[PDB]
Design a protein around this ligand. Structure first.
Ligand SMILES: Nc1nc2c(ncn2[C@@H]2O[C@H](COP(=O)(O)OP(=O)(O)O)[C@@H](O)[C@H]2O)c(=O)[nH]1
Lengths: 608, 221
């Protein structure tokens, strides 16, 4: 049984965390980094389950907030300390943290702790019991008004509550604190803990060769192919940190004693000649490098070339707060990776909450927070010109944002249903001259894909859904590709017209008087996969790669040329006599030319 | 306006915060440089990654003076307000702050004026960046003419010869092939006296630069 779990001590600046921690572990200066430790709790009950929590005393100061979401995981318990002294407003000051615990670790407990009980205002439990309980917040499970700097019945009850609430974790009835692991994992952990002492203090990092030498020098029977799983599991438990990603040159270095790494990386936000390049690589991996923090926080006046509601495309993104390192990861992601063409470097004007790439007066793109009146929520208005290049940019930007949310902040998309993230689309029936763009939730417009227009109570007015949300109707791509549904003669339901058995869901249809093979990509999934495939296919154009004929949203389908003689596999099976030396050579030559063109475009055709 | 202290106080009233004369009110508000309020423009340069690095693809010109005069940047911003187009039409992107403008049409037709401070120099500077193409040369001509006109019209004492002249216009050239850096700075009057030829040449005369790609307002480019 693995008796080890992470305890995370979240909070705001100045509120007692390290002092509370010093009195919780009975271990009788501003935090910089996250200050990892670990205390072993010898439970004296009949179930003497000796557990080891490893605490993460998060620093409250704002400048470190970019790196915190990297160290917030699910299999961890949270504290949240909030300084009772400035009552009734220090509770409303830690709602960002709780929202962030909700976004990163949506199903982890939270034990609210009110410090500074000596001074004063204990009726802050009112707002805690009314506004902070269930309205989009991470499942609070106890709340204590404790003192620090001295042990009493308050801290005793708080410590006992941490113990109890730890043991009864049960993510989907799992009991995190007592699950089972291969014995080799705990053996590896013990040898790593011993290696913590025998390593230079100035540099605690260990080498992959040194790890291999260590696991071989003792009887640990972990095979070479098993080491990634083990080291990643020890990573999840907060023993050692490592980054197996090959995009970085760090996978040969296994960070033991992680508190040193975290402190050292956060050192430059307040201000080994071999690893300078690796230093910079992982500095970017922590989102420290151009320092994305300290970017003046002040929107510079920007007079766009195009006013007029019929010449720009707006999209909002509503959420109660921006997650901690949201804008940093977004700016980094949007860094010239969204070009209008498929080249030219654009002008860029960054601040702390915006980017504004700008090629031309008709090929710009401005992402950036915009605050509205009588709305405490936060918004991410995106402005883009109505032209073709504009539509392309809007597609790329929306996909990047959506990807980031699904990858880092899943709790902002979990359906209960306000969903905590409502993507709007601003349309203006008002002829472009008049104003006050009517805002329509994006999902409602997605359900309005049956037609190709939006129409008000007075149906004399209309707007095409292309000039509102060209990522839904397939307009963001180059080379407008809709399939003119009057000319298609497809019949989906019959297996009569399957392109062939075991080609996926590829069928046979006749489009514009010629036989074509139509893949039905329609499913419960969104337009993510279809638009991805269409983007890839829309610019290849080689005689040895299948050509794209059209694409349709009703239903989600692809239209490609029909290979009359079927796949090569059937020829090898059925008519072997048809293949002659000249034909075999021609097939090999054509496939080789195809692969050559793909590699000339830096694309890897995974399996062939 | 009789009793002028009332006019002056009333006009300065809005910088701390008669239905007939609203339009005249706004006109003379602009005449006092109060209107977009040119003051309170956040004073903080926003990061700008220009499309073109490389010393052989941009044209720099400085303007050195001990301090910026009082209302200098306001009158300058007002003067440069879209009145300097590359073509003779299209409205450009504009990103104002308290000490800069940065009109930007295209990745080859931009223009960034704005104060730039140097190390070990208490003076103030007005670096102007511009692409080396034709439209760039046009923009640089218009901008230099506007600045020179403003100086001659409002701050004559900054041009009175005694002779440091209190305003030394530099021109940044780089003999260093564009790859290397530290653009050698040459006073503009010296290059004007170097109009006899059409090139500038260092101690090692194997290198040369045409005066067009340094100061295309002197040679008619
Ligand atoms: N009297 C009293 N003082 C406290 C209490 N909790 C914290 N403090 C004071 O607050 C400071 C704690 O700072 P700290 O929480 O470590 O800063 P942080 O690391 O950024 O969170 C210390 O100077 C303590 O004296 C408390 O319960 N009672």
């Amino acid at each position: 049984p693995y008796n080890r779990m992470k305890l995370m001590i979240v909070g705001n600046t100045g509120s007692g965390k390290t002092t509370l921690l010093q009195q919780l572990m009975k271990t009788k200066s501003a935090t910089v980094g996250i200050d990892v430790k670990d205390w072993p709790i010898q439970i004296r009950d009949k179930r003497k389950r000796d557990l080891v929590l490893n605490v993460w005393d998060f620093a409250g100061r704002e400048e470190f907030y970019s790196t915190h979401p990297h160290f917030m995981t699910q299999r961890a318990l949270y504290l949240a300390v909030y300084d009772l002294s400035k009552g009734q407003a220090e509770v409303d000051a830690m709602k960002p943290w709780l929202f962030n615990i909700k976004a990163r670790a949506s199903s982890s407990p939270v034990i609210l702790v009110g410090t500074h009980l000596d001074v004063s205002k204990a009726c802050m439990s009112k707002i805690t019991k009314e506004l902070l309980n269930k309205r989009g917040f991470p499942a609070i499970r106890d709340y204590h008004f404790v003192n620090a700097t001295e042990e009493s019945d308050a801290l005793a009850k708080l410590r006992k509550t941490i113990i109890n609430e730890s043991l009864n974790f049960k993510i989907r009835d799992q009991l995190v604190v007592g699950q089972l692991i291969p014995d080799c994992y705990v053996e590896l952990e013990k040898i790593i803990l011993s290696e913590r002492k025998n390593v230079p203090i100035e540099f605690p990092v260990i080498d992959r060769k040194r790890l291999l030498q260590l696991v071989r020098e003792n009887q640990l029977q972990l095979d070479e192919n098993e080491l990634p799983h083990a080291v990643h599991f020890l990573n999840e438990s907060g023993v050692l940190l490592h980054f197996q990603d090959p995009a970085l040159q760090l996978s040969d270095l296994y960070f033991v004693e992680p508190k040193w790494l975290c402190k050292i990386m956060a050192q430059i936000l307040t201000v080994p000649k071999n690893y300078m390049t690796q230093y910079f690589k992982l500095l970017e991996k922590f989102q420290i490098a151009l320092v994305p923090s300290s970017l003046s926080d002040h929107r510079p006046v920007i007079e766009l070339p195009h006013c007029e509601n019929s010449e720009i495309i707006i999209r909002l993104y509503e959420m109660p707060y921006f997650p901690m390192g949201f804008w940093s990861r977004l700016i980094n992601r949007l860094l010239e990776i969204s070009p209008y063409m498929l080249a030219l470097r654009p002008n860029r004007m960054y601040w702390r909450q915006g980017i504004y790439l700008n090629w031309s007066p008709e090929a710009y793109c401005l992402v950036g927070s915009e605050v509205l009146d009588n709305h405490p929520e936060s918004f991410l208005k995106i402005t883009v010109p109505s032209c073709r290049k504009g539509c392309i940019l809007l597609g790329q930007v929306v996909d990047h944002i959506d990807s980031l949310m699904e990858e880092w902040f899943p709790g902002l998309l979990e359906i209960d249903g306000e969903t905590l993230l409502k993507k709007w689309a601003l349309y203006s029936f008002n002829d472009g001259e008049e104003h006050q763009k009517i805002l329509l939730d994006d999902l409602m417009k997605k359900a309005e894909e049956g037609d190709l227009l939006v129409n008000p109570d007075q149906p004399r007015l209309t707007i095409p859904i292309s000039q509102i949300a060209p990522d839904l109707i397939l307009a963001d791509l180059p080379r407008n590709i809709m399939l003119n549904n009057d000319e298609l003669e497809f019949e989906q339901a019959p297996e009569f017209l399957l392109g062939d058995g075991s080609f996926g869901s590829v069928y046979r249809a006749a489009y514009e008087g010629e036989e074509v093979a139509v893949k039905i990509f329609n499913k419960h999934t969104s337009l993510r996969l279809l638009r991805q495939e269409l983007v890839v296919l829309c610019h290849l154009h080689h005689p040895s790669l299948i050509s794209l004929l059209a694409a349709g949203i009703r239903p989600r389908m692809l239209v490609m040329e029909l290979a009359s003689k079927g796949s090569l596999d059937r020829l090898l099976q059925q008519d072997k006599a048809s293949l002659t030396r000249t034909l075999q050579h021609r097939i090999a030559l054509h496939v080789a030319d195809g692969l050559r063109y793909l590699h000339s475009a830096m694309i890897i055709y995974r399996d062939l």
